[PDB]
Each structure stands twice: as C-alpha cells, then as structure tokens.
C-alpha cells in the first residue's frame, strides 16, 4: 500500500496517441495528448515556481491544478470535466474512458473485431443443394481464397510466381478460365462457415462445403433455414474461412451442418421437413 500515492506518472505510448496528417493538411491526435501537456506544463511551471522563489498561495494554487491534472489523464469527470478549447464541450477521453467508456476497450473487446477472411452477400434458396454443401459465388471465393489460389496458380502453369499470379488477377478481364479450374481445385475439400443476422444459438453459424456458382447470390440449403432464422426477402449471410488445418478439422468435423441435426435445447430435431416439404409429403 505505499504505491497508491503517485509521484511518477506512466505515459502511454506515442503511436497510441497519434499525431496525423489529414486533408488540406488537417491533423488528428488522441485526446490523451492535450491532457498530457496539461500535466507536463503544470509540473514544469511548478518546478520553476519553486526555484524562482516561493510565495505559498501560488505554490499551492499550482499544486492544486497539478493534482486536478493528474486526475484528467487517469480519469476525467470524477471531479469536474476537462474540455478541448471552445469547439467541443467534450470530455477528453481519459485513460479510464478508454478502458470502460460508452464504447471503450474491454467493452468493444467483446463487441467485435473484423475477420480478415470474410464475406457477405444476399442469400437464395438452393433446393438441389444437399445439407452438406452450400452455393458460394465463385467471384467471392476468389477474393476469399485469394492466397490459397495464388500458390495453386504457381503449382500449375497459369503463373510463374505469386506477384505474377497477383497482377494476373488484379483486373477482371484478365482471368484465364484456367484460374477457376485452379480455385475449384483449391476448395476441393475445404469448407466455410455461414452466419445469420442474429446469431442466437450455436447453430447460428454452420459449416458446409462450397460448390462455386455464378453470380452474386449465396445458395443456402432449405432444411437449415430453420436453424438460422433466415427467410428470403433480402436476408444476407456472412461467410468466413477456416485457415488452419486445425480450424478446418473442427469446422468440418464438429461444426458442419449435416452433423448437428438435433437441437441443444431439446432432444427434438431441428432438421425437420419445414414448410414446402411437409406440404408435399402430406398431400
């Protein structure tokens, strides 16, 4: 407990409190920096006030400001709220405000992050498709499995090297129909995940084998339209890619659709002949 008192203020990294060039020459800096200067200036002015000679009232006066300042970076608002000069009566984000905040750190650390091998398009019923697979726009597969394709291009005559294979595809009109044959080969036994708008239960994400197809839409199987609450009036599903051989292993072993047929809530099936199937089978 002798540490709760502060005499040495840790300063946050620099690139974490950027100074950046914008438009015209506008700049942008982490609010933290205006707070740091506060402290530094006060701490300095303090020193010089002690050295110049010291009239009590003024030394405390400063010591006070100083204190307040030390609050500011740590946590703003607990005692009064600091402001950037006339423009925005906004609480300069205090380190605290960083961790907690309306949308802070641990917080948004769990709201989400953006996956690197992701995609999203409109969905459309794939009646012939089997639970096992799903229809994925080749055009999409291409970007998705880009690196996996690049190398595969090199293993075949389509390109000499990566950088080559890259420029080879940088434009749409340049793709030889040999590339599709390469991608279709890369995706042989790999599978991807599909998500739905509200992911409410584990089946809110399921794995399937892609069967590349033309156009824009994503072919989804009808039987799993019940797990994800997805109807076809514009519902769009995202799609992710299992990169490690492990992530893929699990993905297709314990996360593929045709393996999780019975719900976790009830030992009742969730792969049941939905609407159109019954109607048929009944008549």
């Amino acid at each position: 407990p002798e540490w709760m008192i502060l005499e040495a203020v840790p300063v946050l990294p620099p690139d974490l409190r950027p100074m950046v060039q914008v438009d015209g020459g506008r700049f942008a800096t982490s609010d933290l920096n205006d707070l740091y200067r506060r402290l530094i200036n006060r701490n300095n002015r303090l020193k010089k006030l002690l050295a110049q000679g010291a009239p009590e009232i003024i030394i405390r006066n400063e010591k006070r400001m100083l204190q307040e300042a030390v609050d500011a970076l740590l946590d703003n608002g607990r005692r009064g709220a600091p402001v950037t000069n006339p423009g925005s009566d906004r609480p300069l984000r205090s380190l605290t405000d960083i961790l907690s905040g309306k949308q802070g750190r641990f917080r948004q650390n769990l709201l989400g992050k953006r996956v690197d091998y992701s995609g999203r398009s409109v969905i459309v019923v794939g009646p012939q498709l089997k639970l096992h697979q799903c229809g994925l726009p080749k055009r999409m597969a291409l970007e998705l499995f880009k690196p996996f394709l690049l190398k595969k291009m090199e293993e075949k005559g389509i390109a000499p090297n990566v950088k080559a294979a890259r420029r080879m595809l940088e434009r749409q009109r340049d793709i030889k129909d040999e590339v599709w044959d390469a991608l279709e080969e890369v995706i042989h036994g790999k599978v991807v995940l599909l998500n739905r708008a509200p992911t409410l239960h584990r089946l809110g994400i399921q794995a399937f084998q892609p069967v590349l197809v033309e156009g824009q839409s994503i072919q989804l199987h009808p039987l799993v339209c019940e797990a994800f609450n997805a109807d076809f009036d514009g519902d769009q599903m995202a799609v992710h890619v299992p990169l490690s051989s492990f992530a893929q292993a699990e993905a297709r072993i314990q996360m593929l659709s045709a393996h999780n047929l019975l719900s976790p809530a009830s030992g009742e099936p969730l792969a049941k002949p939905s609407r159109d199937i019954i109607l048929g089978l009944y008549y």
Partner: peptide, 12 residues
Amino acid sequence: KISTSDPVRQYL
C-alpha cells in the same frame, strides 16, 4: 469543491 473561487478567496 470548484477550483477558481477557492484560490480567489485564498489570496483575496
């Protein structure tokens, strides 16, 4: 409480 008044009072 609030910082200006206190010093004002302080030296005044």
